[PDB]
Ligand binder design. Sequence first.
Ligand SMILES: NC(=O)[C@H]1CCCN(C(=O)Nc2cccc3c2S(=O)(=O)CCC3)C1
Ligand SMILES: [Zn+2]
Length: 139
Amino acid sequence: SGAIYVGNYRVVNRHLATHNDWANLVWEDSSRDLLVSSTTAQGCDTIARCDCQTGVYYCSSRRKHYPVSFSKPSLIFVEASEYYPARYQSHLMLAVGHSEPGDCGGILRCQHGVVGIVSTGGNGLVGFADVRDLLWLDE
Ligand SMILES: NC(=O)[C@H]1CCCN(C(=O)Nc2cccc3c2S(=O)(=O)CCC3)C1
Ligand SMILES: [Zn+2]
């Protein structure tokens, strides 16, 4: 679990979004596993605006942060679940690292701010949904 709070927005994995998230829906994209809902309280997370390929993510299944090198956002394949049919997923970045289902939502950050959130895992790889292109989160 986990979310990014920036301005009056809350960014979560679309597969983990709550009823309250869907009732205050701003935008969602099933192909990116992202959902953004509106909030009443002001958020203070800073979103990175960069092409960094190194950063640190939080891994709840180890209560630890790990430094990683990660790929550029791209279209990658993902197997089925109670949540999605087998399909690709866009704006996804992979890194070599530990992840488990409950790890989705963990933040990946670089020196510039928040880069994205854990969205996929398996086979010793972890995948992050990128949020750096969502320029409207800041306005
Ligand atoms: N973005 C997606 O389509 C997600 C939706 C939830 C299911 N998906 C996952 O990758 N889950 C997940 C997350 C992190 C680590 C692991 C897993 S697992 O594949 O369920 C088992 C291996 C460890 C795809
Ligand atoms: Zn950066």
